[PDB]
Design an enzyme around this catalytic site. Structure first.
Site, PDB file in Angstrom:
ATOM      1  N   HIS A  70       0.836  -1.194   0.000  1.00 47.43           N
ATOM      2  CA  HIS A  70       0.000   0.000   0.000  1.00 47.43           C
ATOM      3  C   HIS A  70       0.874   1.247   0.000  1.00 47.43           C
ATOM      4  CE1 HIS A  70      -3.372   2.622   0.577  1.00 47.43           C
ATOM      5  NE2 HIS A  70      -2.963   3.018   1.769  1.00 47.43           N
ATOM      6  N   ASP A  89       1.250   5.410  -0.452  1.00 46.00           N
ATOM      7  CA  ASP A  89       0.657   6.739  -0.475  1.00 46.00           C
ATOM      8  C   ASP A  89       1.448   7.632  -1.424  1.00 46.00           C
ATOM      9  OD1 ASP A  89      -1.020   5.728   1.534  1.00 46.00           O
ATOM     10  OD2 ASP A  89       0.322   6.446   3.116  1.00 46.00           O
ATOM     11  N   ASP A 146      -6.727   2.519   4.353  1.00 43.04           N
ATOM     12  CA  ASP A 146      -6.306   3.699   5.100  1.00 43.04           C
ATOM     13  C   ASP A 146      -7.361   4.799   5.053  1.00 43.04           C
ATOM     14  OD1 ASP A 146      -4.529   5.097   6.728  1.00 43.04           O
ATOM     15  OD2 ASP A 146      -3.548   6.069   5.022  1.00 43.04           O
ATOM     16  N   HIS A 189      -6.481   9.895  -0.003  1.00 38.87           N
ATOM     17  CA  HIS A 189      -6.983   9.817   1.368  1.00 38.87           C
ATOM     18  C   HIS A 189      -6.087  10.495   2.405  1.00 38.87           C
ATOM     19  CE1 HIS A 189      -4.355   6.305   0.806  1.00 38.87           C
ATOM     20  NE2 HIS A 189      -4.106   6.397   2.100  1.00 38.87           N
TER      21      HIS A 189
END
Lengths: 940, 940
Positions: A220, A222, A333, A548
């Site tokens: 994952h 970001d 998240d 997010h």
């Protein structure tokens, strides 16, 4: 009991060999691309220089390249040995062994890691490795070897560790102890012949209710976080390379990617040889794209158009050579979830969803982890929920049986769920010893199916084939209506409103030019008229900051400046450039054009005199006393009282001090009035506090039917100074009794009570909102419109909006500087109950006026026979490739009335089409279901 | 949580049908044999009469016979139905369906039970059933049926029960709940078609680390208990019949029998058709004889001869058609275990042992349940120990997974241990639904070997094949030296000494005539001379009362009178008849014969004047003050002080009141002296207590070298009156400091400390003994000889003998009546340290003198060249079939000296032979190991 005798002894204490090559080693640093540095290497003498030792550094944004030229020692002897080179992992970088440059190899994995040298080709090669700084010094040494000896050491380390996790009451714990015993016997007195032999004896000691335990290695990432996008763009290429080297080493491995744009990032950076790498990789097996989504974002703040593009523009890759996909939807998240998601999923051709947080294990009127989500729309969503251990359970996991027990309790099913890899960082690593992990777990438990079987190579697609069989189709099932509620970590959501002000204004602005630009199609034909290629590039840059983590403003100071940079700004600047562009050859048919989108007093006696309502601030108090309707008869006592309470927590969550009195802004005020007119009335009242700071709000409104409007407008302007770690709010107590709070969510209106669920933990209760929130017994109430603030709270029926927040997080830009805030208070009636919703959301509209030379007639109302006040059309846009356009509508008022849809057009045809802009053969419904999104497509 | 919704609902709430036949039913009662009543049935009109209704009764020792003549209803319709007849189980009885009489059928099983009618033969038969009274009225009704419907009802009952036992955290509990759900759906609205169909659907919901869970159905029967031997003789035949009907119904079943005499009891009662029943039953499979032992007894009280006969005379059945055996030794109800058992086992050809109690789970310097027992002799014993749940875990067990978890914790191994059947009653039942039990447990868990496999059909012989493989041969292993200690429930052991006085006198008396009767072999030849057939019948009756429950005197009042009956008495009466018989034609060579077996004063100044020692009772105090040796120099202060403390517990255990002051017997005594002589000195001192009772002890001894002996003799005569629930003891405080207590166990001397193990629970600490107990630092000490009292205690070095006990148990003969007790106190020295042991044990000898007419010479000492003072020969006897005789010796003093054995004979040969009297090829050892039993055999 010999517990610390077996466990801590042998765990601490040809074979592993360490050789040192000082020469041939080069180092490089840029204090000022892999393709650019390859031309700068062999030519002359550049900043590339001999290192041969450990190189210390200091804090910098610079990256330090490193070159190791290694000659294979002897011929045969050290060839059979395993060749390895250990590096100390820095903040970021890449590792290459290029000729000229073929490869790209993985770096971003944890501080411990292995780099294998090919034993197939005998010769000399090169190594290119850079280290991102933020300093971290690298420890680099060549390591030779054996594989069988190190295997036993790892297997034993995972053995005794599993012995501790196993119940002491079971014989398995006493067994594993004796297994850790016999191994330590021959391992202690330094004997290679004994170790290799004991490894065989241990395997003999190993091998001698239907359930399944599986997992999928995932990363994952970001795209914007405490490290920037440009730097993390180099971080994503390290995630792919770790899999590529793992594929040849181990089969059946599974990887998933939440970013569809991740493909494009790799295709842009490595277009040549790595475009042909993905096709055998993705098509055959071992790779799955989850959700096919362009962005991973919080769904509460933006509109459905943001959720519409990410599906459509993420499905664009499917048109290329791609398209092995999964039905799972992944937002681990993401804080909070929309209630329209069950409706959006089925239409997007994606039937499954995953949620990390926002759940509890108990009888909640809810059974378990696994859940079938029924939205307020009536549609159902089958979703797969990980346990309370979240995604950090299987992340960097050598502990084996440890979290295996804690996974079984929240979940029933026939099987559990495990997510491998870390979701916190520049990107998650994937360990290379997972091959042994699956194998050693097959050593402890036997084979064949009696006891639960261990397979890490199964895909969620086959997992969803199992849920269709075992459990019933269902009528009465796990049921939770609306959203989910757990500790939200709202935090920065209401903090740093300035990045919201820029985005929310850019939100509507980019949502502005979309449809009407297709209304000029007839005017000047070429392709006719629409910024198809132009507006496509626009949505590329905007969705990048909508992620997010990025959107709420939780991040370091460096990328925070990149949020207020042209990235957000130029979007508005380019859109305001285009709106003044397209008008030139369009508005020329308009002499004087008013452009708006739709489809059909006293001081001492303290009064502002008009018919509609009365709102009065008492003298010297500074607090509004009486808001009262004459016709309705409702009188209010306790309005608009600003409240300031400090905050002692970080950016993530919000924790107030224990019973801390919130300081009122009431003070020895003075009275004043901005202007004098029937058109314009603004009365000014000053507020002040300790460590003097000027907190200003404004009062604007139009009287009745000379000014006309039903709603007040109050905008707040505050320049922060001095004291930090404070949280500012303005209270609007209704003085009324209601067990229900009317609030408009994304594409609809959700129904939430005045009191939080009885399972709620955190004291402070605050709710994120789009525009307005109301309290209605349907005969009356109070409506509050607001701007740039997405947060609010339910106090026991006291309306409180959050103006600003200043966290103690390492960000100095969340503390001080000016802010422009705006909100409103509106009177409510049963007849105006549908009006307040209509006067709330889109009020963000900005008046603009411009005129060209005059030839023409400027009045045309082009909309065809719909006229539904209970419905609101959020988005109508064109397609990709034709240029067919789509029309998406949703019902504002639902749960009571069934909206009859007469919506249609002329000169063309129309068919119902889902959110993915994919052709669907039911036709246009004559009646819309309550809380239903109606999307259609238009063809020539 | 719907916990009480699924569990308690459907569990309570062609198919089962109840028909009533009133006529043809007969009843019979004897207020005054199955073969005797069959001739009394058809002839005329006897006490057999029409019943047709429920017959009430009243308390009696009578048995009530019952006859049911049943005609098969219709033809086909009710034939397919399962025929059954339900009876209410009484205290005892038998059930028969004789023609004329072939069968014997099982009764003694629990109040619920089933009797199947043969569907093979179509016709009319008869039924004979008697009910033992002690009243219990029988409920008798004919029950027809289906088998498939009742199966689901049982399977569901064992399903939901297993759901409760399974951990709620596991998905299995939630699974089994849903399994109990779907079944209840079609089961509720009374549908036969649904039930039979749902049973199939449930099986589909069922079937969709190496360990093993097994068990062996067994029946532990006490030959004498609260019900007598003659009545329980009818109870043992009910244990065999339950297996016979089970064999045809279910295969692979396993039964074990702790009684070798159990075979003879069946062969005596049913010699004709049931002698041919056992041979296919035992030889093929499904039956095993454990230990091949004639009796199950406490090994502490009797001698090794009692343990010698039970092995040998229990091996006599092996000479008949018999002999499928096991290596396990079973003493579940036996309290305490001898230290010579590891030596006795290996010689008896039996390598395994089982112990119920006397163990703990913790780190004791001891790992687990499974144990390798190393005696003080040095030999090792591999023994299998059941968990703390004992034998009542699997007894009458429908609970499935319940005790399965509690079994796994104490035991490691690769597998657990379960013992099916009850050991408390006239005999244990064996349930007929065990077939479904093994099957339904194979329904829950899958097949093939991954998870533990469920097999109830495995034999302990194959189980001991598994322990030889998995675990090592071993050097360092679980180790416990000597006996084991847990709550003993000593109880009646010291209570009712009168049954010990009769037995202990009968013990030595039957042990008397044994060997010397083989010494007359030469005198008058026929077979030569020995009561081979005569003394064999003698040991038949004696071993019958020597059982573990019977011997200590814990039982009802009825059989207690059968203990003092000729059963014990006539043995002494027949032996005293034979000793006066064999003498007539033997002693005639003796004019005057002294027959003994071996191989080579003042009052006011309070003194009994002699050289050896001095023991003085102070005036008016009644308590001995100074016991002092002049040569040694040890002076004693605090002797022989009788102490009486009450008892508030039952016969089983002994529990004293909380801090209750023990009443001393000291009172205003008077002084007296029995006789006057140098040969005879007895000084009399009276003791009295509240509720006046005469407690008398005597003083006897021989002076030195006119009287000669080294030891005093003190015998106590007390006639109990009034107050019950009291416990009487006499204290002999040594006033010395020793951490070790010298005590002579069975065949040797065990070493036990002055303080009990730190894991001890019960406050009161008492030890069972044979004859004497000493405290020796080897330079000195105090020796206490005693008679008829097997108990004593260690108080912190205060010697306390238990004279009498009166439990609150429902026995009125344990309270009052006269008693004759005897004991002694002996001076100890390093030189006399080996003497005290020699002067202790066999002192029970009784002087006897008789003379015939004179022709001959009466002095012959026939023993040949041994002369070892550290060794003592307990038993020498003949064989069964030849008449070869065996010689068994054991070393008294061991642990220090290695005894050289020169023991041999003349005119014949000799070879070493084990305790089973079986020929063994090492020869006669020239030196005996410390604490070793040396047994030999003599041939012509």
């Amino acid at each position: 009991x010999x517990x610390x005798x077996x466990x801590x002894x042998x765990x601490x204490x040809k074979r592993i060999s360490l050789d040192h090559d000082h020469v041939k080693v080069w180092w490089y640093q840029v204090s000022f691309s892999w393709k650019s540095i390859i031309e700068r290497d062999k030519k002359g003498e550049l900043e590339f220089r001999e290192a041969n030792i450990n190189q210390p550094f200091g804090p910098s944004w610079s990256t330090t390249w490193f070159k190791v030229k290694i000659s294979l020692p002897e011929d045969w002897v050290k060839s059979n040995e395993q060749l390895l080179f250990q590096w100390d992992c820095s903040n970021e970088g890449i590792v290459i062994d290029p000729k000229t440059l073929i490869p790209v190899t993985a770096f971003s994995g944890g501080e411990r890691t292995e780099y294998v040298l090919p034993k197939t080709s005998d010769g000399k090669h090169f190594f290119y490795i850079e280290a991102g700084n933020n300093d971290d010094n690298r420890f680099f040494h060549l390591r030779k070897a054996d594989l069988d000896a190190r295997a036993l050491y790892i297997d034993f380390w995972m053995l005794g560790d599993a012995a501790r996790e196993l119940p002491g009451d079971s014989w398995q714990k006493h067994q594993a102890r004796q297994l850790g015993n016999a191994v330590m016997n021959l391992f202690d007195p330094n004997d290679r012949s004994s170790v290799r032999k004991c490894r065989e004896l241990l395997q003999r000691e190993y091998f001698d209710v239907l359930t399944n335990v599986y997992g999928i290695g995932n990363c994952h990432i970001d795209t914007a976080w405490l490290w920037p996008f440009a730097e993390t763009r180099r971080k994503i290429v390290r995630s792919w390379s770790s899999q590529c080297t793992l594929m040849d080493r181990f089969p059946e491995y599974k990887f998933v990617a939440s970013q569809a744009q991740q493909f494009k990032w790799l295709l842009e950076d490595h277009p040549e040889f790595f475009n042909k790498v993905l096709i055998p990789k993705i098509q055959q097996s071992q790779f799955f794209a989850v959700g096919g989504t362009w962005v991973e974002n919080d769904t509460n703040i933006p509109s459905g158009e943001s959720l519409a593009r990410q599906f459509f523009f993420g499905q664009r890759f499917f048109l290329k050579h791609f398209g092995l996909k999964s039905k799972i939807f992944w937002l681990p998240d993401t804080f909070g979830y929309s209630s329209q998601m069950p409706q959006l999923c089925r239409l997007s051709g994606i039937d499954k969803f995953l949620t990390q947080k926002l759940s509890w294990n108990n009888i909640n009127s809810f059974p378990h982890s696994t859940f079938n989500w029924a939205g307020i729309d009536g549609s159902q969503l089958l979703t797969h929920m990980p346990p309370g251990n979240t995604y950090t359970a299987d992340s960097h996991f050598g502990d084996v049986l440890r979290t295996a027990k804690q996974n079984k309790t929240p979940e029933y099913y026939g099987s559990g769920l495990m997510l491998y890899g870390k979701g916190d960082g520049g990107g998650g690593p994937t360990e290379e010893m997972l091959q042994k992990m699956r194998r050693i777990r097959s050593m402890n438990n036997r084979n064949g199916n009696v006891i639960p079987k261990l397979q890490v190579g199964i895909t969620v697609d086959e997992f969803y084939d199992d849920i269709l069989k075992r459990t019933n189709q269902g009528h009465d099932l796990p049921t939770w209506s609306g959203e989910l509620y757990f500790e939200f970590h709202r935090g920065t959501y209401t903090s740093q409103a300035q990045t919201k002000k820029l985005m929310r204004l850019s939100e509507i602005k980019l949502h502005d030019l979309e449809w009407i630009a297709a209304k000029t199609s007839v005017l000047y034909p070429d392709s006719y008229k629409y910024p198809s290629k132009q507006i496509n590039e626009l949505w590329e840059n905007v969705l990048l900051c909508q992620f997010h983590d990025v959107l709420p403003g939780s991040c370091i100071e460096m990328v925070y400046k990149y949020e207020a940079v042209p990235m957000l700004h130029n979007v508005v600047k380019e859109c305001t450039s285009l709106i003044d562009k397209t008008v030139q050859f369009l508005q020329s048919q308009s002499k004087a054009d008013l452009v708006e989108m739709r489809t059909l007093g006293y001081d001492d006696y303290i009064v502002l005199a008009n018919g509609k309502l009365k709102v009065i601030i008492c003298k010297k108090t500074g607090v509004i006393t009486s808001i009262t309707d004459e016709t309705l008869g409702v009188e209010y006592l306790d309005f608009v009282i600003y409240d300031d309470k400090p905050l002692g927590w970080q950016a993530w969550d919000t924790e107030l001090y224990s019973v801390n009195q919130y300081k009122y802004v009431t003070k020895p005020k003075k009275v004043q009035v901005s202007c004098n007119t029937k058109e314009k009335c603004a009365v000014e009242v000053i507020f002040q506090i300790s460590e003097k700071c000027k907190i200003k709000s404004v009062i604007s409104l139009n009287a009745t039917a000379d000014a006309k409007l039903s709603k007040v407008d109050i905008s707040t302007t505050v320049e922060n100074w001095d004291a930090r770690n404070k949280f500012l709010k303005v209270e609007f107590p209704v003085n009324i009794r209601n067990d229900f709070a009317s609030y408009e969510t994304q594409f609809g209106i959700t129904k939430r009570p005045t009191h939080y669920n009885t399972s709620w933990d955190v004291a402070k209760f605050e709710v994120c909102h789009h525009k307005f929130a109301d309290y209605s017994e349907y005969s009356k109430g109070v409506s509050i419109l607001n701007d740039c603030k997405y947060g609010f709270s339910t106090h026991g029926n006291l309306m409180r909006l959050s103006l600003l927040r200043s966290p103690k997080a390492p960000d100095a830009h969340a503390d001080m500087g000016t802010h422009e805030i705006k909100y409103a208070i509106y009177p409510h009636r049963g007849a105006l109950s549908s009006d307040t919703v209509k006067l709330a959301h889109e009020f963000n509209y900005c008046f603009k006026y411009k005129l060209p030379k005059d030839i023409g007639m400027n009045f045309d109302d082009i909309i065809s026979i719909s006229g539904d006040e209970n419905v609101i059309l959020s988005n109508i846009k064109r397609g990709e490739d034709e240029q067919s356009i789509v029309v998406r509508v949703y019902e504002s008022l639902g749960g009571e009335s069934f909206a009859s849809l007469n919506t249609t057009l002329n000169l063309k045809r129309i068919e119902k089409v889902d959110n993915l802009e994919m052709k669907v053969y039911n036709r246009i419904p004559i009646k819309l279901r309550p809380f239903e999104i109606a999307s259609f497509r238009l063809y020539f």
